[model samples]
Target: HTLVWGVWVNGVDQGDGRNIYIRSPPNNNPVKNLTSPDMTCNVDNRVVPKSVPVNAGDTLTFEWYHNTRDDDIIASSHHGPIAVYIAPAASNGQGNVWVKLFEDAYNVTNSTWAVDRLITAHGQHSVVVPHVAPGDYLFRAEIIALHEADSLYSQNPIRGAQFYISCAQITINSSDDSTPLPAGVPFPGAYTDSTPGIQFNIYTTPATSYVAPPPSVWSGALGGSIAQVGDASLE
Candidate 1:
């Protein structure tokens, strides 16, 4: 699995352990940390320790990065869609509660998915923050690499589909209450191996009609040219 460098808030780098938490093998428990550090896409649990400033309905620029060691190259073959989710801080900041705010699957054309396009262009992604009452929330970004998902390691992707997840704390600064906060699902319970797009054989799947998972991306949130817009101007 390609390592994630760190998450950022409004183009600012959050300290490695502070808010932009990525999967790094713990020196104490190397295997455990690598297999399960209580972070990553599978767990989706991280210390939501920072309060990033944001506005509802505003484009919250987000990004998914590759290891800097190799010039940030995400192999064209390592393809999958990216997704964003949010959950109002309930009970605690690390709770699993969340809602799918944005997501886009493969775009089978001329032999490529959304990821291929991203690789050819830039490696960043974005989503429009949901419009709701002013409050603190958890904004999560994740990418699923289906390169090796078809392996029998579906139960544990230590050597299978690479599920990369990054959690960023957000402080929604807004007065708009017109749109209600959308519903969400718990973390560990939100995804499963059985999920159609979660684990599939992209190597053999027909390119003509490759069906992406259900519950399409939100309206105007698929993140196209918007990904290039660096600073999101708030209303």
Candidate 2:
């Protein structure tokens, strides 16, 4: 789908990731964009309507992106299509608080699981979740895109990405179908939580493979490799 589902509340502008149109600069924020190893978004690619409140029977969708590669790009940095979850907003966790409900794989191009959540080399994907009851919650994640200096082959490129934590009241009108909600949080082994440092890849440039000629023997490869963020990542 071109755009994900989202709740439109009063006073909220889709652009400003900060401040609930009605409230002050910051509201009960759930998700957050950590420091990147490269460039940065004007406002950390946040959800337009930072807060989403809905009824138990109503479905809640959140979409946010920031890819300035022209073409009015959409989900370049988007990942885990339509992330959904349910809980009471009254309980706010500290630091890494927001609890993940469900994460859909938009693009499975990358070899890594979690990294795959990031949208890259594609237009956009829309996620549809069956049921969402009422409660307080925040759902969001980083945008995914191809690594110009990282790709080993092809000029495949896609831009724009963002994270959001939409929350608010959800008034349920009907009965919930599933037992414990379809799938909250990413599937096991989806993303590597043990990843050492930040998720950004530094950049560097050189003959993809450094070699004078196709060695007759073709004994081995990977003679030299470097990582930098000069023009690749936003660092």
Candidate 3:
């Protein structure tokens, strides 16, 4: 039931529940069905009225908690990757229009997963805002818990990768429009029960490497990769 409770721009907090569309009656529930529309933004589809303004390249910190900002970020047993995406607010964050901004899976060197780092940071997961045309956008932040993914939906309807997601409305004030808007992949369409990352078993399998789902991070440039935390070698 972990969900984003606060969004910080640069180092300033944007107040509690200002622009984020968190699940209502908040609980630590994870979406197990990849094809469910809830995968788009967790249980709520209503647009948040407020849009946090920030310049392109600014850093955004999403603070997650099980019930409160001070609660444990999530169960340590939930080990997996985290991904951030952006889409024009006009699209209402549907279809295949969302572009990936950042993603971190496993760090083979430290034997740590992205969720581990989030916990270390006290539930704060940060990513730099990508350059895009100035306009309204939906900042989608997600964590995929693979603790139960070893079993496919066909085998057990409730057992599979659990997706914890939230969307923050943002207005990027950028003058630069040189970066081409890369095509995006759909959520339900992008992941499947058979996807390597989604079907993994962290407890039983020997870890050598890990894949953080596809349609790699959108390189601000036309075609390139941006290096960040975790193993860039995997990208």
- In candidate 3, what are the lDDT values of residues 1-235, reduced to their tens digit? 5777767777677777634443232466887887878777776667766788887777777777775564677899898888888888887767887898887887787888888878777777777776678888887888888888888765798788888888888888874766756668776578876666878878787655677777688877222111222221222
Clashing pairs in 1: none
Predicted candidate 1 versus true structure: per-residue lDDT over 1-235, tens digit per residue: 3433343445554434333433233221111122343433334454544566767655555444454422343666678776777667662323445666776665544566666655553455666666667887766666667777676354563656565555666777874756666555555454555556755787787545445543444442424322433321220
How high is the lDDT of residue 144 in model 3? 87
**Which residue runs does candidate 3 get wrong by more than 4 Å?**
18-25, 221-235
Tell me how far the alpha carbon of residue 89 in candidate 1 is from the true structure, in angstroms, after superposition: 2.8
lDDT of 1 at 163: 56
Candidate 2 weakest lDDT stretch, 10 residues? 220-229
Q: TM-score for each prediction?
A: 0.71, 0.36, 0.88
| Per-model RMSD to reference | 5.6, 15.4, 5.8
Q: What is the C-alpha local distance difference test score of candidate 3?
A: 0.73
What's the candidate order when arranged by decreasing TM-score? Answer: 3, 1, 2
- Each prediction's total of clashing residue pairs, residues at least 3 apart in sequence or on different chains, is 0, 37, 3
